Design a protein around this motif. Structure first.
Motif, PDB file in Angstrom:
ATOM      1  N   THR A  85      12.392   0.887   0.075  1.00  0.00           N
ATOM      2  CA  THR A  85      11.013   0.730  -0.350  1.00  0.00           C
ATOM      3  C   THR A  85      10.524  -0.697  -0.178  1.00  0.00           C
ATOM      4  OG1 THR A  85      11.656   0.321  -2.642  1.00  0.00           O
ATOM      5  CG2 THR A  85      11.284   2.581  -1.985  1.00  0.00           C
ATOM      6  N   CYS A 136      13.998   0.887  -8.204  1.00  0.00           N
ATOM      7  CA  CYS A 136      13.360   1.008  -6.893  1.00  0.00           C
ATOM      8  C   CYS A 136      12.097   0.157  -6.794  1.00  0.00           C
ATOM      9  CB  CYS A 136      13.045   2.466  -6.599  1.00  0.00           C
ATOM     10  SG  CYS A 136      14.504   3.516  -6.589  1.00  0.00           S
ATOM     11  N   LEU A 181       1.586  12.347  -3.355  1.00  0.00           N
ATOM     12  CA  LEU A 181       1.589  10.947  -2.939  1.00  0.00           C
ATOM     13  C   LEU A 181       1.088  10.781  -1.515  1.00  0.00           C
ATOM     14  CD1 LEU A 181       4.965   9.720  -4.461  1.00  0.00           C
ATOM     15  CD2 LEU A 181       2.676   9.449  -5.386  1.00  0.00           C
ATOM     16  N   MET A 200       0.803  -1.216   0.000  1.00  0.00           N
ATOM     17  CA  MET A 200       0.000   0.000   0.000  1.00  0.00           C
ATOM     18  C   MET A 200       0.839   1.270   0.000  1.00  0.00           C
ATOM     19  SD  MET A 200      -2.871  -1.210   2.761  1.00  0.00           S
ATOM     20  CE  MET A 200      -3.837   0.292   2.730  1.00  0.00           C
ATOM     21  N   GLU A 201       2.138   1.177   0.267  1.00  0.00           N
ATOM     22  CA  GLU A 201       3.045   2.312   0.303  1.00  0.00           C
ATOM     23  C   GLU A 201       4.147   2.164  -0.734  1.00  0.00           C
ATOM     24  OE1 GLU A 201       4.244   2.100   4.353  1.00  0.00           O
ATOM     25  OE2 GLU A 201       2.753   3.569   5.024  1.00  0.00           O
ATOM     26  N   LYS A 231      -3.910   1.192   9.020  1.00  0.00           N
ATOM     27  CA  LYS A 231      -4.401   0.657   7.756  1.00  0.00           C
ATOM     28  C   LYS A 231      -5.254  -0.585   7.962  1.00  0.00           C
ATOM     29  CE  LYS A 231      -0.558   2.337   5.032  1.00  0.00           C
ATOM     30  NZ  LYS A 231      -1.464   3.292   4.363  1.00  0.00           N
ATOM     31  N   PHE A 241      18.839  10.636   0.812  1.00  0.00           N
ATOM     32  CA  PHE A 241      17.396  10.768   0.901  1.00  0.00           C
ATOM     33  C   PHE A 241      16.707   9.472   1.294  1.00  0.00           C
ATOM     34  CE2 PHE A 241      13.202  10.778  -1.298  1.00  0.00           C
ATOM     35  CZ  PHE A 241      12.591  11.627  -0.408  1.00  0.00           C
ATOM     36  N   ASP A 271      -2.173   8.510  -0.511  1.00  0.00           N
ATOM     37  CA  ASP A 271      -2.128   7.472   0.516  1.00  0.00           C
ATOM     38  C   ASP A 271      -3.025   7.802   1.703  1.00  0.00           C
ATOM     39  OD1 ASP A 271      -1.375   5.092   1.685  1.00  0.00           O
ATOM     40  OD2 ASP A 271       0.415   5.932   2.631  1.00  0.00           O
ATOM     41  N   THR A 284      10.250  17.320  -6.147  1.00  0.00           N
ATOM     42  CA  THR A 284      10.104  16.104  -5.359  1.00  0.00           C
ATOM     43  C   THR A 284       9.205  16.328  -4.155  1.00  0.00           C
ATOM     44  OG1 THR A 284      12.409  15.746  -5.964  1.00  0.00           O
ATOM     45  CG2 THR A 284      11.404  14.166  -4.498  1.00  0.00           C
ATOM     46  N   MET A 293      12.853  10.157  -8.166  1.00  0.00           N
ATOM     47  CA  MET A 293      12.721  11.511  -8.678  1.00  0.00           C
ATOM     48  C   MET A 293      13.804  12.417  -8.116  1.00  0.00           C
ATOM     49  SD  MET A 293       9.319  13.789  -9.060  1.00  0.00           S
ATOM     50  CE  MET A 293       8.781  12.398 -10.038  1.00  0.00           C
ATOM     51  N   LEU A 327      13.277   7.768   4.211  1.00  0.00           N
ATOM     52  CA  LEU A 327      12.143   7.452   3.351  1.00  0.00           C
ATOM     53  C   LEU A 327      11.014   6.645   4.007  1.00  0.00           C
ATOM     54  CD1 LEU A 327      11.476   8.065   0.377  1.00  0.00           C
ATOM     55  CD2 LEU A 327      12.406   5.866  -0.218  1.00  0.00           C
ATOM     56  N   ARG A 375       4.095   3.735  -3.767  1.00  0.00           N
ATOM     57  CA  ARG A 375       4.218   4.937  -4.587  1.00  0.00           C
ATOM     58  C   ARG A 375       5.469   5.745  -4.269  1.00  0.00           C
ATOM     59  NH1 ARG A 375      -0.443   5.317  -2.502  1.00  0.00           N
ATOM     60  NH2 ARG A 375      -2.419   4.816  -3.542  1.00  0.00           N
ATOM     61  N   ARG A 376       6.095   5.506  -3.109  1.00  0.00           N
ATOM     62  CA  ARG A 376       7.376   6.116  -2.771  1.00  0.00           C
ATOM     63  C   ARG A 376       8.493   5.719  -3.719  1.00  0.00           C
ATOM     64  NH1 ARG A 376       7.667   3.810   3.236  1.00  0.00           N
ATOM     65  NH2 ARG A 376       5.831   4.760   4.208  1.00  0.00           N
ATOM     66  N   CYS A 377       8.296   4.673  -4.531  1.00  0.00           N
ATOM     67  CA  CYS A 377       9.232   4.364  -5.602  1.00  0.00           C
ATOM     68  C   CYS A 377       9.362   5.492  -6.621  1.00  0.00           C
ATOM     69  CB  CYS A 377       8.806   3.079  -6.299  1.00  0.00           C
ATOM     70  SG  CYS A 377       8.880   1.618  -5.255  1.00  0.00           S
ATOM     71  N   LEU A 378       8.381   6.401  -6.711  1.00  0.00           N
ATOM     72  CA  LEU A 378       8.596   7.634  -7.464  1.00  0.00           C
ATOM     73  C   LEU A 378       9.669   8.492  -6.810  1.00  0.00           C
ATOM     74  CD1 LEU A 378       5.033   8.914  -8.416  1.00  0.00           C
ATOM     75  CD2 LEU A 378       6.356   7.115  -9.452  1.00  0.00           C
ATOM     76  N   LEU A 379       9.552   8.710  -5.492  1.00  0.00           N
ATOM     77  CA  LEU A 379      10.308   9.751  -4.796  1.00  0.00           C
ATOM     78  C   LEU A 379      11.802   9.472  -4.806  1.00  0.00           C
ATOM     79  CD1 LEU A 379       8.018  10.559  -1.771  1.00  0.00           C
ATOM     80  CD2 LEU A 379       8.441  11.871  -3.851  1.00  0.00           C
ATOM     81  N   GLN A 380      12.189   8.257  -4.416  1.00  0.00           N
ATOM     82  CA  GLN A 380      13.579   7.822  -4.457  1.00  0.00           C
ATOM     83  C   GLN A 380      14.154   7.850  -5.864  1.00  0.00           C
ATOM     84  OE1 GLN A 380      14.157   3.829  -3.178  1.00  0.00           O
ATOM     85  NE2 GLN A 380      16.326   4.104  -2.722  1.00  0.00           N
ATOM     86  N   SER A 386      21.716   7.085  -2.612  1.00  0.00           N
ATOM     87  CA  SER A 386      20.325   6.829  -2.271  1.00  0.00           C
ATOM     88  C   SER A 386      19.706   5.713  -3.097  1.00  0.00           C
ATOM     89  CB  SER A 386      19.513   8.103  -2.447  1.00  0.00           C
ATOM     90  OG  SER A 386      18.138   7.801  -2.552  1.00  0.00           O
TER      91      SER A 386
END
Ligand code: MG
Lengths: 485, 735, 729
Positions: free
Chosen positions: B26, A403, B550, A334-335, C50, B505, B554, B543, A344, B509, A337-342, B20
């Motif tokens: 992740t 990622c 994001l 469910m989390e 959640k 970063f 969520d 970012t 980006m 995370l 989408r943080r694969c964008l951030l690392q 990073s």
RNA sequence: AAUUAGCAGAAG
RNA sequence: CUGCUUCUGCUAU
RNA sequence: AGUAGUAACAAGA
């Protein structure tokens, strides 16, 4: 007393320093080149690059997932009305008849007049979910007397070699598709010039990242884990059909709903956080398993018909698999989408560094190029032995796929490999900067890495990629010997 | 056929700039499934393996097999060594006392002045404490309260003197008791009918009884650690064991860690107790000072290092000598107080977890063999590794399921004193007056060494001498995880210095998710995390705007609060669509009420109701910000309740901890009795939640005097009638 | 409701367990029994959030008549739980009940939110009434400093603020009356007026008051604006590679404006002093300097105070110089004097060595503190005279204390018997004199002892007071309580009508501090008032951009491209005595690389900005030799001649230049047969490369061994770690 | 120039 | 059956 | 079966 106790200490207690040269670095993980080990099988949760989405152009109504699967199967009425299995592949400890009867039960349950997607506890449902497979717990005296109740050995993970499909998953998930899948909400209106700069950077970064295959796969994983946790908490003592679905928008602004298959949640009385719920997944595809036969020893592949995506005609296969997951992988799904951030930030920082050399905002000059700047090209991969330079957005998509695959194939082996190979990456960087690094025990440093390479496909492919890149760096270093001598 | 290599990004970018991407945070961290007897037993064996050449003997207090590696023989190979020489430790402290004159007596004066004011409530600041009255883990306040109410039975009333020093006096006056008496908890295992494979259900209903234990069993329980396995540890392949000390240990560990903290604050070459950007500025200043200290024409090498077996090779017999040499001028009572804690750490008895599970595969059976009954079966009914470990554990295995653990520092509650020992190894700077000089940085077990010399062979001689010196104090520098380059790029506690510390970063995370307290607090937490990572972690503007998007996605998918104009269905989206169609100014709806996001970069520190206060409809603002909303529990005297100011999205989620087949009647009733007494005390004294109430007298006497004075002042100011005053004093006379 | 509490106590004491809990728990152990919890707290809050949202009723209701307004079913949705589970459990509800309250709930009064959250409403007002400027893309050197996060009105220490808050909200159980009650009874009675008839929970009022009163200081990376109005928007202010100009709202203080004025004047003079006619460039920069809303001349007009730098910029613009200085509370005006600061190794009263600034000459001041006046007269490290007026006794005490510390006498240093912090917790350099000033306020009785005493003066209006602050017999040595147009130069000196100077450009301090407000230089090339790494990186970017023109005009011309406007900015961060030496060395190395046809481009880029100042050679017409070129500020700031540096590096294989971290690419502007050329021809002046490593000439010679050679004598030189070469003059 | 706890995240 | 320390963040259940 | 991974879940802490 310290100099006193350093003269009666043996000379065999030393640090043994060794000057690190380029030829001292051997390839990490040699057993992955051995052909007497099996190729590493596909053990992800869902299909990623071999996916097939049955489209249905909906009319602006997020009505229900059961109604969505019913309408999308009503559009493809021939794949819904198959009652004869054509067995293409079978797993070893599987049962093709029970899996086909469970797929027909899912089709007959998702297309009824009812409002519930629950299954009954048939024979095939109790086999595929797994009922009564827990061991009975008895008292300790009866087991102390019983000479048969040994303590079983743990199963060490099997050793595997480099299977050539992981390069295919990297090459295909880092490409551009015609559909979007990201559900990005709106943001507040921009007032400061920082927010104008950020929005004009975000348009480029999103238009590269959103229209790619890994974004569609990422949103498939996120939405399926969200619906799976919802059905796991609301329905613990019930088998529930959960469709694998996605929402897609093409280049024209038209919105489709993509069905990717169905899934059967088992009994999910998940008391602890590492308790397993069994999910029986039936996924559509158009990839013949006879092409790459060692990639799928975990799947049962039927054939359910044909599909005209154009004047051309393709086949459609149904990959069936018993699988499982726990609460923690559902939370981290469910989390995702943080694969964008690392991915980006690591690119945007580079843009910002270029912005502090030229004097203006260099997003357009990096991505597409302008009058006084050639576009940024990065060394992106190999092609028949040589090195190819690709675009900026290509490298952004490659970091995003990396990622995402850190999430997908993530376990303890990837963590241990990541740490113990980062310790070697810093040594290679100290070798490239001409700092002259010194090591004290290199073979143990290599042996801390090589015990993490067991059966994780990303770890084995990353060791293969490490050896490839290290060979390129050793090849490149042979110009420095002509400097001042 | 182009084949993508993701490591080729490192051809154009250096590794520290793109570090990073080397942190797979992740993904899912590794958790432990099942028992923790295997890693505990392997910890005991590996601790006694590096110390088995020292003097082995038998303690005559408990009966355990103690092992003394200190002042033992010198090492012969590059194996881990626990034989720390005492004269080298005292000489390193001589150098560190010469270099910073007056430091030890100032730290001892400050720690003794801090100890004379500290109360016992400092022993409620712990997560999970091993309780000896139940031989389990209770919380720290629960373990402390059971210890105080159990010491009252054995005529140890020194906890009613307020301070910490009479409580520790009661602790060491409990060890010389012939028999201890305490409050234990047993249960009734009621049998109930059910419908499953076994047929019936075993309901465990616990209730509190009184127990009595002998002297030596109390000495074994009070010295015991409780062992478990650590979860969510990223960066490792295999798991490890950790330990937990009792309440009779932490009360002495506090003073020694405070003493070592006062020493560590004033050492230039440490990394404790700094942290954050403070530590970054300190380390950058230190690296610049050691960079300008290079000789003209020399070479300065930097060793990025790590020590192997830090908890497995340090010794409490070295920490006893360190507290004897640091406190060399304090009064004798403080030296006894500061010498108690490494004495209790040299007689620690590790409890061996949960046992091993034996299964019959063909009968589909399994059972749990505990730690006392561990050797009750033959060793052929184990695996290979469990058989080897149980053969190596047998000299130290005591007959109650515990094991002697004299050497090592397994519980690891000396993160500052071992830093003092590492800096004392760093503060030597030369051996034999050879042509080099070292100087370093040391956090608890991570160091970074700088060696300036004439050429790099002399630097290697200096590194070899530092390794040999560290062997003499019990510090085995790991030759597999350490490397040595020139100065300019190193790594210290996952901070990667490449001519200035780079921005990592991916480490911070996993904080970006919805934190999960309620809706309003999660919105505030998420926007503040995005803002602080924009400040000090290199997250740029684009970012950060993507992170805002994001987080909103969520947040909406967690709290089921999608936008009211969208078509998503649910139990909450019905009334959300109704509120969207009802509201005129829909831009003033909160995101939890199906509203639009108006957060951006310039307003990340302003909360959700403040940002949308001039866009709200007055009906929606009055319904949201209601002072008597039943979702926020007010402070009522158990109407006349106080007004709860914050919104309806500050609701409380009662984590109803109810185990399976456990009727928690009585453990709810005792906690309710404590809560009722404290609620009446807070009704009588209003500042009990802001300032800690002091006083060495009974709570009934304090409440009685406060209510008597309150009735007397309410009578003479007209607020209370004479008949009500007579009722009040007639009640207070019967109390 | 005292009688209700008495009745609850009578109902509680008839229960035999709470009776023995109350009778045995002390008030000190209330803190122990309040946190009594039998079950452990759950490990993951995000996983439980959640997982708990996907249930029927996750929330918990508060029992009352306001909870009964919610219906048990709303259009098929069970909002709250059934009441058959009431018995010894509680009532629960779903999140849809919260949304039903926000839609169809009973209306209430929002007065109490605006009172409690007044800090956030002011935080929003300071952003709504704020204008933005422009974003600039360039290097930003951030320094980690302890700053205040949020603006306040009365910054009180937290123990004093807690005592004040107890005297505002809970005055009955407040404790001992301390000194904090006296100096804050205005705030106490005013806040007790404003919070009189309110029904909020008092712990929320305690935390809103401590949000209003207590400070919060953290170590943040700041660059150029450290005031709490600029730290609250620090994320949008600057980054590592961009800077956004911001003009906040609310109101500011004159102390921050004076501090930023001093900083801006110092930076203007420091950049100005290397130019030709520094006065013209100094006025030209000081005109277009804006301290956050307004020009520099208005700030110099309205602010009473400043330093040497403020006075030089004031007299340059045509304003009256205000020769008033500060020492914290001590305001001084220089009557006559001339003193210059040098670093002295002072041993202090507890036996510690510190480099403290000590002045010279002989000086006279009109001193003032609070509402007390005086006249002070001193010399080098000695108090001589101090004639003060009659005022309050503690202000006179502080005045004589500040004159004793300000005199920098030997007795004041020798009386520091205690724990003095000459350093931060993070190892940063605190001021010695302000540390001694803060020490000698309360613990000045040892200074009273070690200063000494003597007789009184026996003149008419001269009587000397004692430590009792009354007109006693024995007074302190040097203290008597008596009852009673300039020009400016080219080099920025303040000469009188006759010629005796009072201030010069040698007298400005070199404490490169961070401004409180934001300074803006509305000028082309406003980067020349940056820090060291910004000037180094911008100068090397300017050499990289114009490399073809500089290379052609160096290969053709002789002395017409060592002079540029960029190197004038680069010279101001080279120290003064070594700038001519660095210039002579780098000019000789560059002329060596031109005259003989060995040319390196990394060395040309590296040693070109050092060729600005006129060359200071040795005493026989030959240049100096250097290993590194040390620049101003910090330990990292140097340019290695042979190696790489923190501020300069070059990769010859990839042809990649690294300036302060940022990587430019030299691939494309280079001679394609340069990697066959040796570095040692561009390493020393007059020394070239002829052969290989020869042990027949000795070891690797140092700088002093090479400067005392003769033409023709060969030596061995180690460029970097691994390459020994031979070298001939 | 200087300025009372609970929970979460990271590091050791 | 989720230990100790440091830093940061939020809140006053 | 399966998830997995040095030991557990696959319902009765
Ligand atoms: Mg390290």
């Amino acid at each position: 007393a310290i100099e006193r106790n350093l003269a009666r200490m043996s000379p065999l207690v030393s640090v043994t320093p060794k000057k690190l040269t380029w030829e001292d670095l051997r390839p990490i993980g040699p057993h992955i080149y051995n052909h007497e080990l099996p190729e590493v099988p596909y053990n992800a949760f869902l299909l990623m690059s071999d996916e097939l989405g049955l489209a249905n152009m909906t009319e602006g109504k997020s009505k229900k997932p059961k109604t969505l699967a019913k309408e999308c199967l009503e559009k493809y009425s021939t794949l819904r009305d198959q009652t004869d299995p054509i067995l293409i592949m079978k797993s070893e400890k599987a049962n093709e008849n029970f899996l086909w009867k469970l797929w027909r039960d899912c089709v007959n349950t998702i297309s009824n007049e009812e409002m519930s997607n629950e299954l009954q506890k048939t024979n095939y449902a109790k086999w595929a979910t797994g009922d009564g497979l827990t061991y009975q717990k008895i008292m300790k005296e009866v087991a102390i007397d019983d000479e048969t109740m040994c303590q079983e050995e743990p199963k060490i993970p099997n050793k595997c070699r480099v299977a050539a499909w992981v390069q295919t998953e990297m090459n295909l998930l880092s490409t551009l598709t015609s559909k979007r899948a990201l559900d990005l909400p709106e943001i507040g209106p921009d007032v400061a010039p920082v927010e104008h700069v950020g929005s004009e950077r975000r348009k480029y970064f999103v238009n590269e990242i959103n229209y790619c295959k890994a974004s569609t796969v990422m949103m498939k994983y996120v939405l399926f884990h969200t619906s799976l946790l919802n059905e796991s908490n609301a329905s613990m003592g019930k088998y529930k059909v959960i469709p694998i679905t996605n929402r897609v928008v093409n280049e024209k602004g038209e919105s489709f709903d993509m069905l990717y298959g169905l899934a059967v949640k088992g009994q999910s009385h998940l008391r602890g956080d590492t308790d397993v719920v069994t999910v029986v997944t039936f996924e559509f595809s158009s990839t013949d398993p006879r092409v790459d036969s060692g990639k799928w020893p975990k799947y049962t592949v039927f054939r359910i018909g044909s599909l005209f995506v154009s004047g051309r005609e393709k086949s459609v296969y149904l990959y069936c698999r018993v699988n499982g997951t726990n609460k923690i992988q559902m939370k981290w799904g469910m989390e995702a989408r943080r694969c964008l951030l690392q991915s980006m930030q690591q690119m945007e920082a580079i843009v910002e560094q270029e912005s502090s050399i030229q004097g203006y905002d260099m997003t357009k000059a990096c991505f597409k190029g302008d009058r006084v700047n050639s576009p940024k090209t990065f060394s992106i991969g190999t092609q028949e032995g040589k090195l190819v330079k690709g675009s900026f957005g290509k490298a952004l998509r490659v970091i995003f796929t990396k990622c995402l695959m850190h999430y997908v194939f993530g376990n303890a082996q990837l963590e241990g490999f990541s740490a113990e190979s980062r310790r070697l990456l810093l040594l290679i960087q100290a070798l490239k900067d001409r700092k002259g690094p010194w090591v004290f025990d290199l073979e143990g440093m290599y042996s801390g890495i090589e015990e993490c390479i067991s059966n994780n496909p990303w770890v084995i492919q990353s060791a293969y990629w490490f050896n490839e890149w290290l060979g390129f760096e050793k090849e490149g270093s042979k110009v420095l010997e002509s400097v001042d001598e | 056929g182009m084949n993508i290599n993701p490591y080729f990004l490192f051809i154009d970018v250096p590794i520290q700039a793109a570090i990073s991407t080397t942190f797979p945070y992740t993904g899912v961290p590794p958790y432990s499934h099942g028992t923790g007897t295997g890693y505990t037993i392997d910890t005991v064996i590996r601790t006694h393996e590096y110390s088995n050449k020292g003097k082995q003997y038998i303690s005559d207090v408990t009966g355990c097999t103690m092992v003394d590696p200190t002042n033992g023989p010198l090492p012969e190979d590059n194996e881990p060594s626990a034989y720390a020489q005492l004269d080298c430790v005292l000489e390193a402290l001589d150098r560190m006392d010469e270099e910073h004159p007056g430091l030890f007596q100032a730290a001892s004066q400050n720690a003794m002045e801090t100890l004379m004011v500290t109360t016992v409530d400092k022993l409620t600041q712990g997560r999970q404490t091993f309780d000896w009255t139940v031989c389990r883990n209770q919380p720290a306040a629960t373990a402390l309260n059971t210890t105080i109410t159990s010491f009252r039975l054995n005529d140890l009333n020194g906890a009613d003197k307020g301070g910490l020093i009479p409580f520790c006096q009661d602790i060491i006056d409990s060890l010389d008791r012939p028999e201890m008496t305490f409050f234990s908890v047993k249960n009734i295992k009621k049998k109930l009918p059910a419908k499953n494979r076994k047929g019936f259900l075993i309901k465990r209903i616990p209730m509190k009884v009184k127990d009595k234990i002998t002297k030596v069993e109390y000495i074994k329980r009070a010295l015991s650690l409780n062992t478990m396995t650590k979860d969510a540890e990223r960066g490792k392949l295999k798991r490890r064991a950790i330990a937990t000390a009792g309440i009779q240990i932490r009360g002495f560990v506090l003073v020694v860690e405070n003493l070592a903290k006062n020493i560590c604050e004033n050492l230039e070459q440490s990394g404790l107790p700094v942290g954050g950007n403070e530590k970054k500025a300190k380390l950058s200043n230190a690296v610049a000072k050691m960079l300008s200290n290079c000789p003209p024409g020399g070479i300065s090498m930097t060793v990025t290092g790590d020590n192997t077996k830090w908890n497995e090779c340090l010794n409490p017999r070295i920490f006893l000598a360190m507290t004897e040499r640091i406190t060399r001028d304090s009064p004798i009572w403080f030296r006894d107080f500061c010498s108690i804690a490494p004495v209790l750490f040299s007689n620690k008895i590790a409890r061996l977890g949960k046992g091993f599970m034996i299964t019959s595969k063909t009968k589909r059976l399994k059972a749990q063999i505990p730690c006392p009954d561990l050797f009750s079966i033959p060793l052929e009914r184990y695996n290979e590794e469990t058989r080897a470990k149980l053969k190596k554990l047998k000299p130290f295995f005591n007959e109650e399921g515990t094991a002697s653990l004299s050497p090592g520092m397994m519980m690891g509650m000396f993160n500052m004193l071992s830093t003092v020992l590492g800096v004392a190894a760093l503060g030597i700077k030369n051996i034999g007056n050879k042509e080099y000089l070292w100087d370093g940085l040391q956090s608890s077990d991570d160091f970074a060494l700088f060696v300036n010399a004439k050429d790099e062979e002399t630097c290697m001689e200096g590194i070899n001498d530092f390794y040999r010196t560290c062997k003499l104090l019990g510090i085995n520098m790991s030759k597999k995880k350490s490397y040595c380059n020139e100065t300019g790029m190193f790594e210290f506690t996952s901070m990667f210095y490449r001519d200035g510390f780079v921005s990592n970063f991916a480490m911070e995370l996993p904080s970006f998710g919805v934190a999960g307290v309620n809706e309003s607090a999660d919105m505030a937490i998420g926007m503040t995390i995005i803002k602080n990572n924009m400040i000090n972690n290199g997250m740029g503007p684009a970012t950060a705007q993507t992170a805002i998007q994001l987080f909103i996605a969520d947040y909406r998918y967690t709290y089921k609060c999608h936008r009211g104009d969208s078509k998503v269905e649910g139990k909450r989206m019905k009334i959300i669509k109704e509120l969207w169609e009802n509201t005129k100014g829909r831009d003033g709806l909160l995101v939890a009420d199906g509203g639009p996001n108006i957060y951006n970069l310039r307003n990340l520190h302003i909360p959700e109701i403040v940002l949308k206060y001039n866009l709200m409809d007055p009906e929606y603002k009055g319904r949201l910000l209601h002072p008597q909303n039943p979702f926020v529990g007010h402070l009522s005297i158990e109407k006349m309740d106080y007004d709860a100011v914050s919104g309806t999205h500050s609701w409380r989620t009662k984590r109803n901890r109810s185990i399976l087949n456990t009727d928690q009647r009585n453990m709810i009733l005792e906690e309710q009795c404590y809560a009722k007494c404290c609620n009446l005390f807070e009704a009588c004294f209003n500042s009990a939640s802001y300032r800690k109430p002091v006083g060495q007298h009974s709570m009934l006497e304090a409440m009685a005097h406060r209510l008597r004075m309150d009735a007397r002042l309410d009578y003479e100011s007209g607020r209370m009638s004479k008949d009500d005053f007579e009722k009040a004093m007639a009640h207070l006379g019967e109390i | 409701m005292t009688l209700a509490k008495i009745e609850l106590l009578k109902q509680l004491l008839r229960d035999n367990e709470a009776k023995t809990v109350l009778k045995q728990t002390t008030v000190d152990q209330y803190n122990i029994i309040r946190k009594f919890n039998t079950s452990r707290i759950e490990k993951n809050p995000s996983l439980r959030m959640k997982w708990a949202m996907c249930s029927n009723f996750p929330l918990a209701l508060t029992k009352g008549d306001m909870a009964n307004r919610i219906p048990l079913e709303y259009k098929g949705i069970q909002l709250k739980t059934n009441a058959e589970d009431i018995g010894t459990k509680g009532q629960m509800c779903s999140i849809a009940a919260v949304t039903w309250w926000n839609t169809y709930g009973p209306i209430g009064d929002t007065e109490g939110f605006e009172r409690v959250y007044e800090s956030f409403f002011l935080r929003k007002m300071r952003l709504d009434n704020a204008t933005w400027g422009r974003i600039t893309f360039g290097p930003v050197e951030r320094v980690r400093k302890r700053v205040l996060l949020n603006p306040l009105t009365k910054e009180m220490p937290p123990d004093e603020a807690s005592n004040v808050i107890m005297e505002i909200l809970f005055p009955k159980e407040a404790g001992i009356p301390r000194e904090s009650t006296w100096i804050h009874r205005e705030l106490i009675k005013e806040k007790r007026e404003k919070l009189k008839g309110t029904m909020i929970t008092p712990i929320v009022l305690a935390y809103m008051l401590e949000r209003e009163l207590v400070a919060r200081r953290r170590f943040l990376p700041v660059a150029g604006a450290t005031s709490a109005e600029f730290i609250e928007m620090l994320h949008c202010l600057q980054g590592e590679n961009w800077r956004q100009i911001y003009h906040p709202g609310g109101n500011k203080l004159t102390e921050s404006r004076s501090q930023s004025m001093i900083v801006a004047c110092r930076k203007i003079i420091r950049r100005s002093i290397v130019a030709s006619n520094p006065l013209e460039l100094a006025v030209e920069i000081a005109n277009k300097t804006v301290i956050d809303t307004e020009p520099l001349k208005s700030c110099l007009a309205a602010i009473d105070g400043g330093d040497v730098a403020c006075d030089i910029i004031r007299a340059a613009l045509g304003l009256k110089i205000r020769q008033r200085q500060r020492f914290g509370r001590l305001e001084l005006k220089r009557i006559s004097g001339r003193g210059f600061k040098n670093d002295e190794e002072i041993l202090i009263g507890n036996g510690t060595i510190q480099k403290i600034g000590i002045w010279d000459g002989e000086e006279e001041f009109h001193v003032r503190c609070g509402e007390c006046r005086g006249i002070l007269k001193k010399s080098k490290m000695k108090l001589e005279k101090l004639l003060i007026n009659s005022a309050k006794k503690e202000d006179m005490r502080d005045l004589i204390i500040l004159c004793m510390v300000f005199s920098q006498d030997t007795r004041m240093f020798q009386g520091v018997r205690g724990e003095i912090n000459f350093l931060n917790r993070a190892g940063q350099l605190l001021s010695p004199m302000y540390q001694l000033q803060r020490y000698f306020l309360n613990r000045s009785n040892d200074l009273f002892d070690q200063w000494g005493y003597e007789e009184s003066p026996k003149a008419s209006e001269l009587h000397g007071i004692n430590e009792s602050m009354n007109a006693s017999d024995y007074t302190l040595k040097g203290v008597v309580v008596t009852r009673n147009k300039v020009s400016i130069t080219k080099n920025l000196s303040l000469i009188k009508r006759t010629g005796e100077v009072i201030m010069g450009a040698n007298d400005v301090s070199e404490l490169e501090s961070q401004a409180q407000l934001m300074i803006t230089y509305d000028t082309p090339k406003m980067w020349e008032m940056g820090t060291t790494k910004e000037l180094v990186q911008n100068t090397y970017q300017w050499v990289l951009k114009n490399l073809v023109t500089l290379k052609a005009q160096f290969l053709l011309g002789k002395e017409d491209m060592f002079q540029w406007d960029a190197f004038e900015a680069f010279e101001s961060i080279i120290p003064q005595k070594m700038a001519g030496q660095y210039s002579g060395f780098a000019r000789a190395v560059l002329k060596q690389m031109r005259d003989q046809e060995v040319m390196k481009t990394d060395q040309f880029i590296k040693l070109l900005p050092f060729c600005f100042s006129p060359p200071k050679l040795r005493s026989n017409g030959e240049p100096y030799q250097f290993l590194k070129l040390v620049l101003k500020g910090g330990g990292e700031n140097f340019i290695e001649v042979r190696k790489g540096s923190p501020l300069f590096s070059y990769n010859p294989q990839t042809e990649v230049l690294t300036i302060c971290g940022r990587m430019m690419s030299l691939k494309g502007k280079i001679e394609d047969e340069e990697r066959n050329r040796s570095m040692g021809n561009a390493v020393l002046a007059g020394f070239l490369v002829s052969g290989k490593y020869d042990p027949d000439l000795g070891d690797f010679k140092t700088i002093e061994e090479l400067e005392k050679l003769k033409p023709g004598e060969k030596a061995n030189i180690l460029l970097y770690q691994g390459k020994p070469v031979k070298v001939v003059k």
